[PDB]
């Protein structure tokens, strides 16, 4: 049973908008606890999220009737409300993700035409006018390209999405929600059309760079079973992942690529030390995780003194010559790359992996980084992120590296000669957390 949410969506998306404190009663009293009258209004907001999940897989659902699908012109007047941010934000995403992909669509809502005719009459009112609307219509003219063919309206919407409200203000925000990641599945399945016929958005440069980094089922649901379109899928992918809408919407092996792919991109980051076009750095050094499990067999050579992460022959964590060159992303999420890389180090020295270098090395690579007490700990990121979803994954990988050796033996061992080096930092309060919760007495205002 998934078809019975028909009315449950339009309710819930309305009640989070303008509609907050609402009384008919008057002269309300004051002081007791000084009650709980306030409190329950925050419960309301929590709840509005819980309902709307089902709209993040509403392409696994049946036809939505002509009635509510009609009203987008006295339901278009709150702009789809584009942390109480995210809570609001849902409605743009849900109503977009009504149309995903799996190969399901066929009309030659999304089965009906009375829908599009009735809606269209009242339109020209933006990239929410056009998001999920002109997309079903791109297929609706793509199967009419041996028929009469209508484009007139469809281009006009295409042009109109280029005015006022931007389209990027959507593909960024999708990511910035993450309560359950069914929200970040709206992308990497809808991005095929956004380059295909709309005049090419330069600013994808920014956004899609973040999206190629990893993706194992989630963002890659949208092809390899599809054939629905004749444009932008795996019809053009069978041929080296490097069109040029090929890398703006779409995703042993080591040496079959390119001596290895590993040996290639060694020096390619040693170039960068003052460089710009941050796009590169947040999709390449962050795609270091699709080969970093179970292997360090050739990576090790470079890692000894990388310009990813080093302190034994580089100043800072080799990203204060790539953190003081910028204030932007590619320092921030670079430093997150440092942390993810580090737990993948300890994670394979709880136990052996194979063809792969020695366990003793996989701790000494961290022991380079042992340089932080001085003031390398203080440098690590600039200005404070004080929003309560992230900057909390910054010392949650540093904190567990005296739990994975002093209380976590999984090979019989673990500690042998490693204690000598270990104890330079991990056996001395910093790694044992005497200053981890004290960076976080105004950055975390929360569980207090």
């Amino acid at each position: 049973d998934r078809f019975n949410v028909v009315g449950k969506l339009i309710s819930i998306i309305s009640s989070v908008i303008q509609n907050y404190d609402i009384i008919t009663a008057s002269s309300l009293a004051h002081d007791y606890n000084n009650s709980l009258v306030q409190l329950k209004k925050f419960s309301d907001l929590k709840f509005i999220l819980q309902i709307l999940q089902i709209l993040n897989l509403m392409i696994l659902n049946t036809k939505v009737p002509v009635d509510i699908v009609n009203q987008w012109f006295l339901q278009y007047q709150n702009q789809f409300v584009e942390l109480i941010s995210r809570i609001s934000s849902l409605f743009t995403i849900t109503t977009i993700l009504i149309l995903g992909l799996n190969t399901s669509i066929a009309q030659f809502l999304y089965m009906d035409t009375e829908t599009f005719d009735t809606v269209n009459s009242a339109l020209e009112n933006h990239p929410m006018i056009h998001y999920s609307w002109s997309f079903i219509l791109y297929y609706r003219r793509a199967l009419q390209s041996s028929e009469s063919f209508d484009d007139s309206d469809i281009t006009k919407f295409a042009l109109f999405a280029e005015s006022h409200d931007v389209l990027q203000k959507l593909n960024t925000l999708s990511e910035i929600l993450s309560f359950d990641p069914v929200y970040t599945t709206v992308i990497t399945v809808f991005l095929e059309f956004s380059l295909n016929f709309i005049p090419i958005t330069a600013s994808t440069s920014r956004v899609f760079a973040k999206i190629i980094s990893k993706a194992p089922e989630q963002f890659i649901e949208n092809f390899l079973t599809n054939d629905t379109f004749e444009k932008k899928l795996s019809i053009i992918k069978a041929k080296l992942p490097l069109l040029i809408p090929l890398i703006n919407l779409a995703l042993e092996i080591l040496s079959y690529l390119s001596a290895s792919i590993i040996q290639v991109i060694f020096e390619i980051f040693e170039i960068s030390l003052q460089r710009k076009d941050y796009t590169s750095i947040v999709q390449c050094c962050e795609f270091m995780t699709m080969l970093t499990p179970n292997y360090l067999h050739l990576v090790s050579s470079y890692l000894n003194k990388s310009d990813l992460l080093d302190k034994y022959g580089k100043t800072g964590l080799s990203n204060m010559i790539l953190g003081s060159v910028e204030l932007s992303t590619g320092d921030y999420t670079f430093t997150i790359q440092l942390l993810k890389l580090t737990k993948v180090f300890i994670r394979e020295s709880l136990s052996l992996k194979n063809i792969h270098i020695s366990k003793r090395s996989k701790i000494d690579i961290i022991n380079k980084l042992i340089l932080h007490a001085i003031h390398i700990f203080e440098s690590y990121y600039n200005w404070k992120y004080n929003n309560f979803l992230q900057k909390f994954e910054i010392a949650f990988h540093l904190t567990l590296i005296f739990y994975d050796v002093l209380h976590d033996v999984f090979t019989i061992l673990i500690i042998s000669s490693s204690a000598n080096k270990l104890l330079q930092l991990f056996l001395t309060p910093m790694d044992s957390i005497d200053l981890a919760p004290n960076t976080l007495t105004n950055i975390l205002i929360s569980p207090l």
């Binding site: 941010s85 910035i176 200005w383 004080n386 929003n387």
Partner: protein
């Protein structure tokens, strides 16, 4: 003495834009550039903004708790709706303790105002000598390139490079003959 100097020499460019048509908050920001605090509060008061005028009368002073709140509030804006004012954003850049070293860097006042208009912002609302001078003016060279061609420019530069003056002195003696 030094900030009197910084303030004196941005005298005409700020007074020119006082005369000219301006945002209400663009006038409060410009008063603050000639280092006037009470006047800036009084214009805040006139816009019916009392809570704002509290914020203008922290300035002349920073303290550590307001930075974290100012940062938290600029970030609330980003993940918030649309439409912001720029100068309101500038008032929070003062409050963040961090005029350039916060999440936004001011390049709207090196195309309208001087690099000297920038040096006023570090030394007055980029912490008030909890750091040494020398390191403040050096971090501020690195951020913004202070000419090698202005003579008052090179003064700053060899107060910044106090540490190993000789090298940067030979080089700029070829580039400043005024």
């Amino acid at each position: 003495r030094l900030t009197s100097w910084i303030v004196s020499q941005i005298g005409p460019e700020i007074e020119e834009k006082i005369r000219n048509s301006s945002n209400e908050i663009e006038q409060i920001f410009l008063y603050l550039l000639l280092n006037d605090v009470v006047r800036a509060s009084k214009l805040a008061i006139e816009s019916k903004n009392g809570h704002l005028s509290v914020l203008i009368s922290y300035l002349g002073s920073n303290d550590p708790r307001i930075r974290d709140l100012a940062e938290l509030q600029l970030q609330k804006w980003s993940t918030g709706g649309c439409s912001i004012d720029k100068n309101i954003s500038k008032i929070y850049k003062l409050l963040s303790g961090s005029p350039f070293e916060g999440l936004f860097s001011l390049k709207e006042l090196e195309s309208e105002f001087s690099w000297l208009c920038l040096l006023n912002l570090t030394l007055c609302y980029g912490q008030i000598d909890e750091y040494s001078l020398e390191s403040l003016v050096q971090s501020h060279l690195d951020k913004f390139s202070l000419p090698y061609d202005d003579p008052i420019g090179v003064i700053f530069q060899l107060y910044a490079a106090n540490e190993n003056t000789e090298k940067l002195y030979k080089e700029v003696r070829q580039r400043t003959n005024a």
